Amino acid sequence: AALVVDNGSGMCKAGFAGDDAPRAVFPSIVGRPRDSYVGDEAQSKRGILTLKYPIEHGIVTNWDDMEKIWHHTFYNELRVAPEEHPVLLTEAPLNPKANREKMTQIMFETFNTPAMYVAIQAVLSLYASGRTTGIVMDSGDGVTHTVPIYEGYALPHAILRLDLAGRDLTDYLMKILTERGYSFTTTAEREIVRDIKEKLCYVALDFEQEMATAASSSSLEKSYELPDGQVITIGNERFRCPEALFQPSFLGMESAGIHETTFNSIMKCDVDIRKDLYANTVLSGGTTMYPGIADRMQKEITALAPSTMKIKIIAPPERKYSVWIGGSILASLSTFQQMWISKQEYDESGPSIVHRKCF
Amino acid sequence: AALVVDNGSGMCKAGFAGDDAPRAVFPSIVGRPRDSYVGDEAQSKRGILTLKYPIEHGIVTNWDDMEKIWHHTFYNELRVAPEEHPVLLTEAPLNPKANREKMTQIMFETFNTPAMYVAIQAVLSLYASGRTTGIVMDSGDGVTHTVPIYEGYALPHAILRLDLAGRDLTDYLMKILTERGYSFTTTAEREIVRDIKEKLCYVALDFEQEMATAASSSSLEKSYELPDGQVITIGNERFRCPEALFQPSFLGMESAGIHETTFNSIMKCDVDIRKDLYANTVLSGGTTMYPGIADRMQKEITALAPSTMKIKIIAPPERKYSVWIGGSILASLSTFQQMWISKQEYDESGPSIVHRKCF
Amino acid sequence: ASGVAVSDGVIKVFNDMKVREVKKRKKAVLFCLSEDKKNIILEEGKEILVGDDPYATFVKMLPDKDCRYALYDATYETKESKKEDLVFIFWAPESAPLKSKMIYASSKDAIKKKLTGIKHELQANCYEEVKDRCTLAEKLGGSAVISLEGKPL
Amino acid sequence: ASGVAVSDGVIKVFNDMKVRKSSTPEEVKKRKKAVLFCLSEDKKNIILEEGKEILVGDVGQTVDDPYATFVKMLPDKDCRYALYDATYETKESKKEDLVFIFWAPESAPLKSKMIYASSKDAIKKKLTGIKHELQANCYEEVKDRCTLAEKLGGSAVISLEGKPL
Amino acid sequence: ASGVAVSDGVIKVFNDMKVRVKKRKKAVLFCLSEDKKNIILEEGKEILVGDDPYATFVKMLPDKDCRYALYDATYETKESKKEDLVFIFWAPESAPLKSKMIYASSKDAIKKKLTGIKHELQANCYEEVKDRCTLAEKLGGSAVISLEGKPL
Amino acid sequence: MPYEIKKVFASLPQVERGVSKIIGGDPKGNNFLYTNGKCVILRNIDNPALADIYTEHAHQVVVAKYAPSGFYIASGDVSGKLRIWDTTQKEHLLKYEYQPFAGKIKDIAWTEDSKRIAVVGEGREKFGAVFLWDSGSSVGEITGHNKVINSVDIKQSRPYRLATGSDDNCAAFFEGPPFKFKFTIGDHSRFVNCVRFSPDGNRFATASADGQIYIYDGKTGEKVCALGGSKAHDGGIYAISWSPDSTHLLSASGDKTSKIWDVSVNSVVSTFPMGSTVLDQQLGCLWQKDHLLSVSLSGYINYLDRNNPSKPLHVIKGHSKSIQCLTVHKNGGKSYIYSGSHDGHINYWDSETGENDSFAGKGHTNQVSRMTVDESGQLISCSMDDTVRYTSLMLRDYSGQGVVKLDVQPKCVAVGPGGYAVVVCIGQIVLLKDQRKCFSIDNPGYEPEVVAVHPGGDTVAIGGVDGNVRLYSILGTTLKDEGKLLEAKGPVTDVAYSHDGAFLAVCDASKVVTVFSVADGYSENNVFYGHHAKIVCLAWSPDNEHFASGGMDMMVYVWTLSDPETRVKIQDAHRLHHVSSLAWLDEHTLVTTSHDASVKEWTITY
Ligand SMILES: Nc1ncnc2c1ncn2[C@@H]1O[C@H](COP(=O)(O)OP(=O)(O)O)[C@@H](O)[C@H]1O
Ligand SMILES: Nc1ncnc2c1ncn2[C@@H]1O[C@H](COP(=O)(O)OP(=O)(O)O)[C@@H](O)[C@H]1O
Ligand SMILES: [Mg+2]
Ligand SMILES: [Mg+2]
């Protein structure tokens, strides 16, 4: 059996090839005292330790903490020995080549994996939608990526990286929930706010009209029960928190919204292919799971795009783990057994074999 | 005293005739809220307003915005009344004749300048180097131009424009600095990266050889201090960032490098004059101020040049502002006072007078 | 890349179709994964002869819940000239299962790159995208094309 | 926003001090190099200080260091608005720019500090075209000739008022 | 153009040398007037026909200033021995930027006044003017076997 | 003739880990050829010292192939440009130039009649093209591959066949001309590296990364056997080469061994263990006449010995990386040329016979900037790993030698009599006595770039970016600034005293060489003009009357000290590369090296 590991900016999704969903989804954090706790242990260890993301915006910056997360993944989460299972790993768009080789070296030398493979997260989401040409709007935990792909080849000159993602929305919801009198400050209370965000938040088609609706009634108010039994109510904060995706000025940011970042990357491509990109905009990632986000994305992009063009936003129901699901389907194919990079091949061509075998 | 204004794609250089250096050098941007800020005022406000370039590739696109830059230049930067001083202006190569008539119209009606003159930027750099025949590679902020000149007459059929310039190099350094964990996304942080580019970046004679030796080089590592006191460290990105000038594939572009663009324009001329163009390759512009860019240009062009041909790349120490200094020297000459386009001559002929006096 | 191997009969069929008896020339042909899902085989009874609306009878041949590859020898007459070029069609309906969509999409470059010389690729992810006669014209020559399949557009 | 208005005398002085029009050499010496503004006795207008000014002609003849004598004009127990016409020089250009200095020593009475700070935004927005602002709250913050250099250009400034740093 | 006007002395000197002995001149250097308004003749910067003519001409060229020149090059081809006038624009890189701009921008005015000249030499350093291969090619393309008597 | 090329010490093949290296042989069996950077090397197989270099590509040449007629060679680079050039004449005049596709070219094949060329690789819209050599018109289509094609071969006997090997673990079979797809062979399970037809054409073999070699019929493409049974090698085979009689096959693999296979009986004849380190992996091979070649990952060319498999006949060493420094030494009765590259390798060459080797042991780990020899027969070399090393030139072994570690990266080193070495670092001057740091001139007030010690070992001349040469004196264990500033025309790039110490020659970036007379108050003696680009190197002839300078204009001038007007123009001593360093073997022989990793000797006649 092969292992599929999706190294997200904030959450690590791991499992076995052929399964419908990842077995383990844990935070991609390494906590050290204010000895070293990785994953959910760092979350459930009080505010006595500092938390650090080795992957924070899709790119591995600390390779010592990344090994700790991978060791935690195989032994504590997957409960398997990496030396007995091939591992399929996913890499962010615009990943430096040096980082790609370092990932290969760690698997074969630190974990002694018999076989290993690297895939691009964006192309796995696009392939899972039955498409080879299109633009993928992958909004995750710490980074949002708009990757235009034409005939299976991502266009590096047009890939836009946006630091706005679910992590900034969780902190924004904490800030605006204190307006109602709810004090969410500790690390334990941050996880509660994330649950509220993932259950009661939605994207409003018309933000200004929705704000008037909330202020003139209570039909939008919803109740959430805290772990200790207290029930809190949330009103206009349900659609205000994900509105920061389309209006980053709510967070004090300079960057454009996810709709404008998608439009900017499309306009950075050749005119011949812009029509196909406009009609093949695929959403992926956890932050794209808000209800009504496809309708809002369709309306906002239509305003920016020319009237003659056709805009289609694809939001598959499995888009939350579309990167992992695509990798699991690929790694479980009987024809994929020849696409792996063996240990024997590694110690004959070095880490540079990843550029020839993969990519 | 006369005024000399060098309208660039990214920077506006202005001053007085007879001065060694321009008095004012400010960004050529006009910002409007997300009432109107022009120049360094827009940079000091950042996210509240939206930045736009009227001159983005040497050619004016927004004549309404460029009027405000000119008004900012005369009153806020030079602190002089335009109606009391003749103004010498510089135009980009392959400037449309309609733009020439608009430029001479705005000066005489909106600003009531007594006298005016318009000069080609490329010929001013060539004249400032003591040459009348040659090819000038003007690599600026938003555009790179290779202008072959034959006895003071630029050959329009052989002028090639390359959009790769200093602006793209700053974005490239911004992107590859995030691989080290540094976050440079906001507009204010972009001028910080531009300062790093202008101080620590250099062109390597052989990129492959430099990459190998820099791995164990103790002098490659340089430290830069941010305005807030933080210290960032830059390594092999010092020679990787300007390498995109010769290898546009680093940016995802399919275009040729500056060495090939220079060679292509020479091959577009008569075989009679190609010998003089090869021996009189003059480098001008801010983006040509990298240490080692003249030695690299000579090595690269010699490969494309025929077997028996003399290649002489000219990189004068003042090539950064050669366009302005040439204009300032020309405008300060007493014998030049008869070549001004007088206000009386404008009324008799109209905006078409620029096509005859300024040539 | 899934790792499936394109059958050698696909390359020969494309070679015969690329160059230009007439009653036996193929106008359309469908490709599918084999039963073991390790080969891009040619569908036995899903093809159109030249001698036999040719585009309508090809679209209705596409399955409603499974992905397919196709090779259409679309003919069109532009204002300047009349030309005929092969179009590679990647039929991948949204109603198709997740596994079928992923394997077909990840193995599309295996077959497309084996058919060198192809210049047009139509990615149809719904019936409205393949039935649409206008988008196929735009793929072929864009605004240059005025009539498709012998009929005005 | 205290609502204090800017007198037309201050605006007229600023307009003359910003734009340099062609004039006789005896008229260039009458230009103002540094001028101090203050509140009216009724505290309703920002009037111009009578004798607290430096002319360009005095520079190089009687005033050896224009900045050093300008700081001496600032009271040490009251807040003032100042306009200094600094002529510095960077490694690439020789610049001449206007600097708006908000003098507000800690020894000043709180009534003066509050009105001057609250009404500063009103006068600054009327003086359009000024880029540099020096906020000085003690003598040590403004006496040092370097503190102008960091505000003007930063580390790029190599000369200030004709003398090296 | 800068607008510098060539004086009549240079025109009369060029005219006599253009139309064809010890009084005749072989080389002459044109400099800029102290007013920087006219192209005037330099006093001790001429080579007399009666008086290596090319080697001493290069010695007369200043190392830190730009000058104009008029050389009566005598190249002997295999077919015949032709002598033609050449225009030399001395503009060394060590010259001040003010001089280089004025001389370069006020050159087409001089050339148009000196009607009937074909060959031009644009020397920006000593190696471009000391060497004889570049001068020979301007006079005759792949036909010159010797220049100024000395074999190439 | 003013100058004449005497000996060319060719560069080693440019090899990469995990990438097959293609070595071509001529139909005449005289010269085997390979590529390195932009250069195509034509080495004589009988005498590897004799070599010829073709440098006319603007990109990195990947493969070159002799025509079956032997009159032309087709070479392709990473930009997809194919050049056909004549080989009968030394000028190597270009015949035809083509761009079959916009992508990397991997292999080239000719037809027997030598009028059709098959070029394969990875293009934007195709992977191969076969065309007429004189018109570029397609005479076939290469289809059936969805990944980059690594190898191509054409059957040299009628009927013609074409076989390709690509990265999709498959080999395609074509028949022509015109070449049409026949079928795809999918026996291999990894990248197919080499596909070679036998010289008689009756069979062809495909080698791949899975350690298997398969033999197929050369006419029908039906599998005959698998070499070695279960496997041929314990690692990926990178190259195969048939014997001239078409009965044996020589294979080079990444398991650090090469083997000879009896194809007809499917038995291994000889196994050659090449080593046990990563650099001992074999990436290319060639079987020409009785010569069996094998190229290691280190770039060394091994002449395999059939009688003694463990020890090869010859191991052709040299530089596969750009050479930065070059010095000459006369030990005993033979003169040796020492050269160091940017990888730290130092290789010595015999001046007359051309035999070359490297010092034993472990030496420098980064670029060797400068090398010099003192009076005690020791090679003093400064390198970019902040170390100055003293190596005995008679032991030829790094182990047990003296290493001096510097806190600042050195840029130049010079030596003088009395065990005195002056090292110029980045903004620091270090004086070494008896391999020990005894003085420092940190913060010298300028930026030193070069250093020269007088032959009397008393005066030190140090140039700077400012364009001024400043003189020092080695008194005791300190250097004293004499307060003398020689003036140049620009940033000093090299300074060299005369061998008798009577003249100091200074070259700068202003294309000027200034000679100062040491005897008369260090005053300027002469100024030499003629360079049209920055001068990078300078050397003094042993006769003390001539000196040579090389610049970035790709030109070398030999200057007569008495007469500045007389000079020898060595135009394009190394084509497309400036001469990085140069030295004199004697008063009539000039040695030049460059970044093409080749060393050349020139006979200078005045
Ligand atoms: N059902 C949901 N609705 C709204 N937001 C969600 C939902 N699920 C996850 N999110 C957010 O998605 C983020 C992580 O999702 P993911 O796509 O895996 O990012 P990454 O790739 O960086 O690991 C989390 O910050 C989470 O809060
Ligand atoms: N000293 C320098 N070294 C390297 N790059 C520089 C340097 N100075 C400027 N650059 C770049 O040159 C650009 C501006 O130069 P400029 O010639 O004025 O172009 P333009 O006139 O088109 O605006 C800027 O992008 C700047 O970053
Ligand atoms: Mg993700
Ligand atoms: Mg410019």
Side-chain angles (χ1 to χ4, degrees), chain D residues 71-139:
Chain D
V71 179
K72 300 310 171 292
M73 288 185 330
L74 298 166
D76 50 62
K77 258 80 144 52
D78 207 1
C79 309
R80 293 284 183 257
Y81 294 132
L83 221 50
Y84 188 67
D85 202 293
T87 88
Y88 61 109
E89 151 151 28
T90 61
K91 316 214 253 303
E92 301 255 65
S93 313
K94 310 175 35 133
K95 306 213 162 192
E96 295 190 349
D97 284 307
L98 269 155
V99 186
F100 183 78
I101 303 184
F102 170 45
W103 175 241
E106 327 271 25
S107 44
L110 204 138
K111 209 151 132 52
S112 74
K113 302 162 78 175
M114 175 80 202
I115 299 151
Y116 270 100
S118 50
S119 53
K120 165 201 148 302
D121 192 9
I123 180 185
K124 209 193 180 308
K125 87 177 90 214
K126 296 265 285 273
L127 307 192
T128 66
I130 185 142
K131 26 183 103 181
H132 314 298
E133 177 203 350
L134 185 66
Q135 187 205 20
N137 294 105
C138 70
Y139 201 62

